[PDB]
Design a protein around this ligand. Structure first.
Ligand SMILES: [Mg+2]
Ligand SMILES: [Mg+2]
Ligand SMILES: [Mg+2]
Ligand SMILES: [Mg+2]
Ligand SMILES: [Mg+2]
Ligand SMILES: [Mg+2]
Ligand SMILES: [Mg+2]
Ligand SMILES: [Mg+2]
Ligand SMILES: [Mg+2]
Ligand SMILES: [Mg+2]
Ligand SMILES: [Mg+2]
Ligand SMILES: [Mg+2]
Ligand SMILES: [Mg+2]
Ligand SMILES: [Mg+2]
Ligand SMILES: [Mg+2]
Ligand SMILES: [Mg+2]
Ligand SMILES: [Mg+2]
Ligand SMILES: [Mg+2]
Ligand SMILES: [Zn+2]
Ligand SMILES: [Zn+2]
Lengths: 169, 117, 292, 77, 49, 190, 86, 55
RNA sequence: CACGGGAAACAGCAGUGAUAAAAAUUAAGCCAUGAACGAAAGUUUGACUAAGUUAUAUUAAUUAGAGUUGGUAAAUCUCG
RNA sequence: ACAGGUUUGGUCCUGGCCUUUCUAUUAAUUCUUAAUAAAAUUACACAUGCAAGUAUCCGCGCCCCGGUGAGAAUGCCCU
């Protein structure tokens, strides 16, 4: 990316390195902010930087902007049970907003490695099949077994045509 | 795809190579093809002896007993394989063809003894 | 209460024994290289990077466990004489799941005679490797662990790579691991190559084999030649810990000896060639007093 | 393979299947071996059914699951 | 008696949790009664409960 | 070749230093091809019978070169010093048969320890080292195992009642087959 | 091409000049050497005790060809071609 | 599934209706269904030949 | 769509016409896996297994022919 | 793309075409044997042979396997 004022925020590394993952009950995340005054600077930097990362880590959660209706910026969370979480920002900076959201409602770190742990249980090494899901295709490729007939030819005594010839004679 | 009926079956799926067969132990639907779409691959069975002279069998014990507990039917070779495993008792087809080999080989011994004279 | 390898005293003794050489522990390796990353750092950030490299070095020198030889498994679960001649080969049934630890898996062999028995340790580890791939293990026994190839690598002083292949290939309670490690420690004892394994995590293994095999002579000579004597009397204190009923330990308790007196007592008492240790310590003492 | 609406074969239209010869003692011991075989397999299969019921009932309403629910509710509050 | 390797898992699982008692586990067959083949099957539609 | 069983003697010889010098064997060889980009696959085999076809390979133009695991100085020229991988055949210029032979020779040399290559530091395989579990430790034997009897009473053969034999003969009359007695305990061999 | 190449390689900035103009240590972090802090140049003169200002989002000019190569979207058949010796 | 271009097929429902009506009207009686020819052991209605164990 | 009407259906395995630049055996068995049936020995299976034909593609050798020689782009002498 | 050839008496810039790399069918020339993988012109019409049977009758199965890409922007992913 050459175009844009900050071209680095449009890369896959920046979208993947933002670590805020909401709970499963979170549905709507709404930012009301202003474009004037030094008070809303942190909210404007939050909108300019982190909302792509949160939206990448939560693709099913709606995130909506509103500009210049309320004199103080705020964030509003709408849950599944009709629950409304208000986070008020007036002088908090961007990193403090990030830790504040991640501490109010995010996913715990231990829940993150356990979530990828039952994600990693699905790919068991002992299965066989295609390369895209499984590590091996033949049982031939295993070192101790019989080599594959497309690479190393089999002995004559194992071959079915020789078996048919000896049975018919 | 959608079928009119059928049941869940734990069976042997034939993949592999020409004159080098391979059976994957497969819990799948009955009406699907032998190498078609499956529910879960449980284990594997090597039909050929290795350099160590071993025929190598892998079973996924908790998933096999879960599928049998929720009602998966078993085919005759996988009941034979489980009977040799000892998770299930010995299959009476293995019992009877074992005694048939005893009778046939004893009759072959008697025939060889008569042909010696 | 016999001393074991995981005791805190012997662990801190081996940690201060192995030392810390950053350039030796961080060596440019032979995989596919990538362009390095540069940054501008202050001095305090430089000691911060150095110290996080220090705990990285400690978790790299997390030492492998050493155990005794395991007992063979000879247990037959069922005997069936009715299947004595139905099959020619033998069947191996292997428990596979992600949640069962590998020591607790069921690896069971049907013999061609019809016996349902437990598999032995070698075929058990082979089944663990076949139905669980991991890098560094070959399914068959490699040609590299033959004695001619070991002597080739040892003449090419590849001892750290031989030990790394041994711990990657075999299991520490196996017999092949024990005999390969013991032959390695015997050959480095004969050649005096202890400086190769200083900042290696496998230093504690040969120290433990030496303190159980009662051959501390050449290692003490090497340490006094490399001028590290606090760690040498730490080794003597390790010897006194592993041998509480030793006449060196009673002479030490009688005299109330310090470090250098402890080394002198060990050299006069239980060193096989104590004359060499005494002359080497005398040379070190006169050199250190002259130069300091 | 064939289909409902195709006619059968003319050669096999007048053909009826033949069961094989029976060895009576071997048949009787065989029939018994199926009876207590299917008995043992049925008992094992209802044992695995009870295991499936136990695991599913625990996965739905286990004491650990109420501790997780109470803890997440308390943390939310 | 159990099939032998399943009996081995029963012994291993009770030894893992510390059950010292060496009583032989027994598979019970009161629900395993199988009505033989010449019983006439029920051709009436079963009411789902 | 007069060398044969010792290929490293020609590597240590004066003629190798006179001809090739400190630079590798494949440094002075240039492959002729169709354009600005060489093909991904080289020539399959360069010598067919007694006939050498065209410009020979860097290995194959000097018949005193032997591709073996015994010489390390020849095999090092096809292995990168820093990266530590085998050079591909378009990089060097050898034929495909000798490239396969080179790959097998480097594999055998690394398996015999004559060539240095990267060995990563591997953690121990298991977390806890315990023999106490019944998978590896012996279980107490079965009451049917100590008695020497089969695991089930029906594993052996039992003589059926004569009324049941007569009932089966009545039901399968006309299609009957000759009965057999008890099976043998142990088979003899032919 | 020759004039631009020589201008670009003559406008090349060395690590000694970078350390002298920043008055800070420069550290080379090799990937094959692990987390070891190799110091390749040191600032002669007065060493500054003030750290660099750590920006959360750096302002750098990125090239779309380079980012496309990094993200693996360069599926051109000519990029991975095996060629001859140097 | 559901799309915006689905067209209202009527002939499939009508054919199922006529098929159900015709089987309900011409449901075979048990006498003509199960009458047996005693020499051929072949069913005139279903076309099936009896097994030899029931001969 | 399939009540009905055109009209007597191989988009099953083999094969035949027409057509197309496009060319597998009108073949052996259920011995092994799957499916169907039966309480079961078991029966069927042109799925499948074992083969037959084909440089279509890789490998091994038993094998030597094709393209090109102005530049890109390796490589030419004399005649018409 | 590590690029190259090509506009003009000639240079620079812009801008197309082609070559160099890999795979698959057909044709031409040539062709020795094996193993493995694959067989692919056609939703045009078919001579003939087989491809759903089992089972003490009832019953159970009978585009289930297998075949093809004609039609439909059809549809992929998710409740
Ligand atoms: Mg195949
Ligand atoms: Mg049809
Ligand atoms: Mg056809
Ligand atoms: Mg034709
Ligand atoms: Mg063709
Ligand atoms: Mg033809
Ligand atoms: Mg033809
Ligand atoms: Mg046939
Ligand atoms: Mg069959
Ligand atoms: Mg069969
Ligand atoms: Mg070809
Ligand atoms: Mg151009
Ligand atoms: Mg012009
Ligand atoms: Mg011109
Ligand atoms: Mg052709
Ligand atoms: Mg019927
Ligand atoms: Mg299809
Ligand atoms: Mg349309
Ligand atoms: Zn294979
Ligand atoms: Zn060559």
């Amino acid at each position: 990316p050459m175009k844009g004022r900050f071209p680095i925020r449009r890369t896959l590394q920046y979208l993947g390195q933002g670590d805020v993952v909401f709970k499963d009950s979170v549905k709507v995340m709404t930012v009301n902010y202003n474009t004037h005054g030094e008070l809303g600077e942190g909210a404007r930097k939050f909108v300019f930087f982190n909302i792509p990362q949160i939206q990448y880590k939560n693709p099913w959660v709606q995130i909506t902007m509103f500009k210049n209706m309320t004199p103080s910026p705020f964030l509003r969370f709408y849950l599944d049970s009709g629950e409304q979480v208000l986070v008020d920002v007036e002088s908090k900076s961007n990193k403090e907003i990030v830790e504040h959201i991640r501490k109010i409602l995010g996913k715990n770190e231990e829940t993150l490695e356990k979530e990828e742990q039952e994600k990693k249980q699905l790919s068991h090494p002992a299965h066989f099949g295609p390369r895209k899901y499984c590590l091996r295709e033949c049982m031939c490729e295993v070192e101790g077994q019989v080599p594959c007939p497309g690479l190393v030819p089999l002995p004559k005594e194992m071959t079915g045509k020789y078996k048919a010839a000896l049975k018919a004679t | 795809r959608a079928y009119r009926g059928g049941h869940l079956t734990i069976r042997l799926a034939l993949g592999g190579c020409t004159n080098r067969p391979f059976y994957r132990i497969v819990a799948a639907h009955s009406k699907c093809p032998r190498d078609g779409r499956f529910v879960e691959q449980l284990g594997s069975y090597d039909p050929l002896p290795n350099s160590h002279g071993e025929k190598l069998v892998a079973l996924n014990f908790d998933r096999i007993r879960h599928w049998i507990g929720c009602g998966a039917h078993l085919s005759k070779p996988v009941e034979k394989l489980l009977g040799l495993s000892g998770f299930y008792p010995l299959h009476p087809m293995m019992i009877t063809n074992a005694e048939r080999l005893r009778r046939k080989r004893a009759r072959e011994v008697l025939l060889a003894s008569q042909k010696t004279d | 209460r016999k001393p074991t390898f995981m005791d805190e005293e012997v662990q801190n003794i081996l940690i201060k024994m192995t030392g810390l050489d950053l350039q030796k522990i961080f060596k440019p390796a032979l995989q596919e290289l990538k362009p390095p990353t540069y940054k501008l750092m202050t001095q305090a950030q430089l000691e911060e990077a150095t110290k996080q490299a220090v705990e990285a070095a400690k978790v790299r020198l997390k030492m492998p466990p050493v155990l005794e030889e395991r007992a063979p498994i000879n247990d037959v679960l069922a005997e069936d004489k009715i299947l004595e001649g139905t099959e020619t080969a033998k069947y191996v049934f292997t428990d596979i799941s992600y949640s069962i630890p590998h020591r607790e898996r069921f690896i069971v062999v049907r013999e061609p005679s019809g016996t349902l028995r437990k598999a032995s340790w070698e075929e058990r580890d082979r089944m663990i490797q076949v139905y669980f791939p991991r890098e560094g293990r070959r399914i068959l026994t490699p040609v590299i662990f033959k004695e001619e190839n070991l002597q080739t690598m040892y003449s090419q002083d590849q001892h750290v790579d031989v030990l790394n292949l041994c711990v990657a290939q075999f299991e520490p309670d196996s017999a092949e691991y024990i005999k390969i490690h013991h032959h390695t420690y015997e050959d480095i004892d004969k050649c005096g190559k202890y400086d190769l394994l200083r900042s290696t995590r496998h230093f504690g293994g040969m120290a433990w084999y030496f303190v159980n095999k009662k051959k501390i002579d050449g290692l003490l000579i090497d340490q006094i030649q490399r001028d590290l004597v606090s760690d040498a009397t730490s080794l003597v204190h390790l010897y006194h810990i592993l041998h509480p009923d030793g006449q060196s330990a009673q002479e030490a308790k009688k005299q109330g000896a310090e470090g250098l007196h402890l080394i002198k007592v060990f050299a006069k008492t239980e060193a096989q060639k104590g004359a060499y240790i005494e002359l080497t310590l005398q040379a070190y003492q006169e050199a250190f007093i002259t130069h300091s | 393979r064939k289909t409902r609406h195709d006619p059968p074969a003319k050669s096999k239209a007048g053909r009826v299947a033949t069961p094989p010869a029976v060895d009576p003692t071997e048949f009787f011991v065989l029939t018994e071996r199926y009876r207590q075989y299917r008995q043992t397999v049925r008992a094992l299969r209802l044992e695995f059914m009870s295991e499936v019921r136990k695991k599913l009932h625990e996965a739905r309403a286990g004491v650990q699951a109420e501790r997780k629910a109470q803890e997440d509710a308390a943390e939310h509050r | 008696p159990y099939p032998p390797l399943l009996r081995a898992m029963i012994l291993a699982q009770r030894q893992k949790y510390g059950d010292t008692s060496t009583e032989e586990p027994m598979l019970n067959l009161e629900r395993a009664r199988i009505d033989p083949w010449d019983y006439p099957a029920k051709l009436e539609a079963k009411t789902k409960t | 070749s007069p060398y044969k069983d010792e290929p490293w003697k020609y590597l240590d010889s004066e003629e190798y230093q006179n001809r090739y010098g400190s630079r590798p064997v494949w440094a002075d060889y240039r492959r002729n091809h169709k354009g600005g980009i060489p093909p991904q696959r080289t020539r399959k085999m360069c010598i067919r019978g007694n006939k050498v076809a065209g410009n020979p390979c860097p290995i194959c133009r000097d018949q005193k070169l032997h591709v073996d695991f015994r010489n390390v100085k020849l095999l090092e020229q096809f292995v990168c010093a820093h990266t530590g991988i085998i050079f591909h055949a378009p990089y060097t210029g050898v034929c495909m048969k000798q490239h396969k032979k080179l790959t097998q020779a480097i594999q055998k040399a690394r398996d015999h320890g004559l060539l240095r290559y990267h060995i990563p530091q591997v953690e121990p395989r298991d977390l806890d080292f315990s023999t106490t579990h019944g998978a590896v430790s012996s279980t107490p034997p079965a009451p049917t195992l100590v008695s020497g009897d089969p695991w089930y009473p029906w594993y052996s053969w039992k003589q059926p009642p004569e009324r049941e034999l007569s009932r089966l003969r009545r039901l399968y009359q006309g299609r009957l087959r000759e009965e057999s007695g008890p099976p043998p305990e142990l088979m003899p061999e032919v | 091409l020759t004039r631009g190449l020589f201008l670009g390689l003559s406008r090349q900035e060395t690590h000694q000049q970078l350390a002298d103009k920043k008055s800070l240590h420069v550290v080379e972090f090799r990937e094959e050497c692990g987390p070891l802090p190799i110091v390749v140049a040191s600032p002669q003169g007065a060493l500054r005790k003030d750290p660099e200002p750590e920006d959360e989002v750096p302002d750098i000019t990125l090239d779309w060809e380079d980012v496309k190569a990094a993200q693996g979207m360069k599926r051109s058949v000519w990029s991975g071609l095996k060629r001859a010796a140097t | 599934m559901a799309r915006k271009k689905v067209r209202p097929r009527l002939i499939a429902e009508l054919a199922r209706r006529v098929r159900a009506l015709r089987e309900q009207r011409e449901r075979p009686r048990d006498s003509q269904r199960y009458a047996l020819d005693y020499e051929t052991m072949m069913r005139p209605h279903s076309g099936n030949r009896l097994p030899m164990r029931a001969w």
